[PDB]
Design an enzyme around this catalytic site. Structure first.
Site, PDB file in Angstrom:
ATOM      1  N   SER A   5      57.062  64.627  87.064  1.00  0.00           N
ATOM      2  CA  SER A   5      56.354  65.726  87.643  1.00  0.00           C
ATOM      3  C   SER A   5      56.905  66.063  89.053  1.00  0.00           C
ATOM      4  O   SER A   5      57.647  65.289  89.683  1.00  0.00           O
ATOM      5  CB  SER A   5      54.859  65.395  87.724  1.00  0.00           C
ATOM      6  OG  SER A   5      54.665  64.258  88.535  1.00  0.00           O
ATOM      7  N   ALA A  18      55.635  71.551  88.726  1.00  0.00           N
ATOM      8  CA  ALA A  18      56.038  71.325  87.377  1.00  0.00           C
ATOM      9  C   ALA A  18      55.672  69.939  86.826  1.00  0.00           C
ATOM     10  O   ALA A  18      55.576  68.974  87.569  1.00  0.00           O
ATOM     11  CB  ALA A  18      57.599  71.575  87.244  1.00  0.00           C
ATOM     12  N   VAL A  19      55.558  69.861  85.501  1.00  0.00           N
ATOM     13  CA  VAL A  19      55.594  68.593  84.772  1.00  0.00           C
ATOM     14  C   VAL A  19      56.522  68.753  83.569  1.00  0.00           C
ATOM     15  O   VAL A  19      56.661  69.866  83.025  1.00  0.00           O
ATOM     16  CB  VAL A  19      54.172  68.122  84.344  1.00  0.00           C
ATOM     17  CG1 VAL A  19      53.544  69.085  83.350  1.00  0.00           C
ATOM     18  CG2 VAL A  19      54.229  66.807  83.724  1.00  0.00           C
ATOM     19  N   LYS A  67      59.282  71.472  79.972  1.00  0.00           N
ATOM     20  CA  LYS A  67      58.973  71.682  81.387  1.00  0.00           C
ATOM     21  C   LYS A  67      57.967  72.819  81.544  1.00  0.00           C
ATOM     22  O   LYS A  67      58.301  73.969  81.278  1.00  0.00           O
ATOM     23  CB  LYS A  67      60.210  71.989  82.236  1.00  0.00           C
ATOM     24  CG  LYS A  67      59.956  71.938  83.745  1.00  0.00           C
ATOM     25  CD  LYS A  67      61.222  72.278  84.579  1.00  0.00           C
ATOM     26  CE  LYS A  67      61.061  71.896  86.045  1.00  0.00           C
ATOM     27  NZ  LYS A  67      62.056  72.557  86.951  1.00  0.00           N
ATOM     28  N   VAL A  72      67.155  64.445  78.044  1.00  0.00           N
ATOM     29  CA  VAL A  72      68.000  63.357  78.583  1.00  0.00           C
ATOM     30  C   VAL A  72      67.154  62.050  78.693  1.00  0.00           C
ATOM     31  O   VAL A  72      66.139  62.007  79.405  1.00  0.00           O
ATOM     32  CB  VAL A  72      68.655  63.775  79.910  1.00  0.00           C
ATOM     33  CG1 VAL A  72      69.746  64.782  79.649  1.00  0.00           C
ATOM     34  CG2 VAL A  72      67.632  64.337  80.906  1.00  0.00           C
ATOM     35  N   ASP A  80      72.066  72.818  94.415  1.00  0.00           N
ATOM     36  CA  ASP A  80      71.150  71.690  94.576  1.00  0.00           C
ATOM     37  C   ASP A  80      71.759  70.453  93.943  1.00  0.00           C
ATOM     38  O   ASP A  80      71.065  69.629  93.405  1.00  0.00           O
ATOM     39  CB  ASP A  80      69.787  72.012  93.948  1.00  0.00           C
ATOM     40  CG  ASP A  80      68.608  71.125  94.521  1.00  0.00           C
ATOM     41  OD1 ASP A  80      68.765  70.430  95.582  1.00  0.00           O
ATOM     42  OD2 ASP A  80      67.521  71.138  93.897  1.00  0.00           O
ATOM     43  N   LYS A  92      72.806  66.894  93.702  1.00  0.00           N
ATOM     44  CA  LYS A  92      72.406  65.657  94.372  1.00  0.00           C
ATOM     45  C   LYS A  92      72.228  64.592  93.274  1.00  0.00           C
ATOM     46  O   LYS A  92      72.124  64.936  92.082  1.00  0.00           O
ATOM     47  CB  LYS A  92      71.121  65.812  95.197  1.00  0.00           C
ATOM     48  CG  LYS A  92      69.977  66.508  94.497  1.00  0.00           C
ATOM     49  CD  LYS A  92      68.771  66.737  95.474  1.00  0.00           C
ATOM     50  CE  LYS A  92      67.566  67.260  94.705  1.00  0.00           C
ATOM     51  NZ  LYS A  92      66.529  67.784  95.674  1.00  0.00           N
ATOM     52  N   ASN A 107      69.846  64.773  90.269  1.00  0.00           N
ATOM     53  CA  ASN A 107      70.074  65.841  89.288  1.00  0.00           C
ATOM     54  C   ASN A 107      71.270  65.579  88.384  1.00  0.00           C
ATOM     55  O   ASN A 107      71.695  66.442  87.627  1.00  0.00           O
ATOM     56  CB  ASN A 107      70.238  67.190  89.972  1.00  0.00           C
ATOM     57  CG  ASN A 107      68.961  67.696  90.570  1.00  0.00           C
ATOM     58  OD1 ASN A 107      67.865  67.416  90.073  1.00  0.00           O
ATOM     59  ND2 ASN A 107      69.083  68.486  91.616  1.00  0.00           N
ATOM     60  N   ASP A 110      68.433  70.862  86.634  1.00  0.00           N
ATOM     61  CA  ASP A 110      67.755  71.552  87.745  1.00  0.00           C
ATOM     62  C   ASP A 110      68.475  72.782  88.401  1.00  0.00           C
ATOM     63  O   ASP A 110      69.172  72.718  89.458  1.00  0.00           O
ATOM     64  CB  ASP A 110      67.285  70.543  88.793  1.00  0.00           C
ATOM     65  CG  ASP A 110      66.164  71.099  89.651  1.00  0.00           C
ATOM     66  OD1 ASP A 110      65.954  72.371  89.682  1.00  0.00           O
ATOM     67  OD2 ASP A 110      65.477  70.264  90.279  1.00  0.00           O
ATOM     68  N   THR A 128      67.740  69.832  99.896  1.00  0.00           N
ATOM     69  CA  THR A 128      67.388  68.605 100.635  1.00  0.00           C
ATOM     70  C   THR A 128      68.409  68.305 101.711  1.00  0.00           C
ATOM     71  O   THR A 128      69.569  68.165 101.378  1.00  0.00           O
ATOM     72  CB  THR A 128      67.321  67.427  99.719  1.00  0.00           C
ATOM     73  OG1 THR A 128      66.489  67.769  98.601  1.00  0.00           O
ATOM     74  CG2 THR A 128      66.762  66.200 100.484  1.00  0.00           C
TER      75      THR A 128
END
Length: 277
Positions: free
Chosen positions: A20, A24-25, A41, A95, A138, A140, A143, A160, A179
């Site tokens: 989560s 989102a979850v 999702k 995944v 994004d 990282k 992800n 993502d 981030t």
């Protein structure tokens, strides 16, 4: 727009929460017609323009419309999209291997050779996206996921696409802000953004892969930001005494302030660390 309006429960059996986040979850699900498993999702809609709960329709539509273009073994595939009065529901490829770095942190040594075999999969996924002029924005370690961790050669999937954007030749793009620890200088200073930001992130990821240490993370968020902006990093012997000159040269050529001097994804695939001559 114009997503599937049926009830997702008529087509899928949903089960356990896989994870989560703020809006989102993700739950495991099983498609009733086929028996195949997927991930579901559930993204909460911002239902009023003034609300700071939920996700705008513009942002969901952008993500969905990029995911629908992508078909590559090293990027997550989107299967279907549903929507009800409160949620947009993405049915994605499952995944089940978890985050790449959690899998690697459990093994014995890990040689450089072994490590670049995973890295090359990341490169090949990014090469595809940039070939279609999509910036992920994004990248990282969290992800980078594994399809299945109990096979001879585990396969990575990039996930993502919440900040992903199509590069528009005729208009500059400014602010994305992901981030701190993993963002390029041009993101920190609100400067024009393009494909080059992902090549910086790959540099960070490569530095962590080989050392387990983060090159720019400081003690507050503001210090991390200033480390990034100033390109204050070092290869400290504690962490890098067994690391090749070529591996270090690859990182150096990515962790460059000026985006236009940074290696591109096509350059990176030809570097002698990745393609020995």
């Amino acid at each position: 727009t114009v997503f599937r309006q049926e009830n997702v429960d008529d087509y899928y059996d949903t089960g356990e929460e896989l994870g989560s986040g703020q809006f989102a979850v993700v739950k495991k699900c099983r498609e009733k017609s086929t028996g195949l498993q997927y991930a579901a999702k559930f993204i909460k809609k911002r239902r009023t323009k003034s609300s700071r709960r939920g996700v705008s329709r513009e942002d969901i539509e952008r993500e969905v419309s990029i995911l629908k273009e992508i078909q590559h073994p090293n990027v997550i595939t989107l299967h279907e999209v549903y929507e009800n009065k409160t949620d947009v529901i993405l049915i994605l490829e499952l995944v089940a291997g978890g985050e790449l770095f959690d899998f690697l942190a459990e093994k014995e040594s890990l040689t450089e050779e072994e490590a670049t075999e995973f890295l090359k999969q990341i490169l090949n996924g990014v090469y595809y996206l940039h070939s279609l002029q999509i910036a992920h924005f994004d990248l990282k370690p969290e992800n980078i996921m594994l399809l299945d961790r109990n096979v001879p050669k585990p396969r990575i999937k990039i996930i993502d696409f919440g900040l992903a954007h199509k590069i528009d030749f005729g208009n500059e793009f400014k602010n994305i802000f992901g981030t701190p620890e993993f963002v390029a200088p041009e993101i920190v200073n609100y400067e024009p953004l393009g494909l080059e930001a992902d090549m910086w992130s790959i540099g960070v990821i490569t530095y962590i892969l080989l050392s387990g240490a983060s090159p720019f993370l400081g003690d507050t968020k503001q210090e991390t930001l200033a480390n990034v902006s100033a390109v204050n990093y070092e290869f400290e012997d504690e962490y890098f005494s067994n690391t090749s000159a070529l591996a270090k040269d690859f990182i150096r050529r990515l962790l460059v302030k000026d985006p236009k001097k940074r290696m591109t994804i096509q350059d990176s695939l030809q570097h002698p660390w990745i393609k020995p001559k």
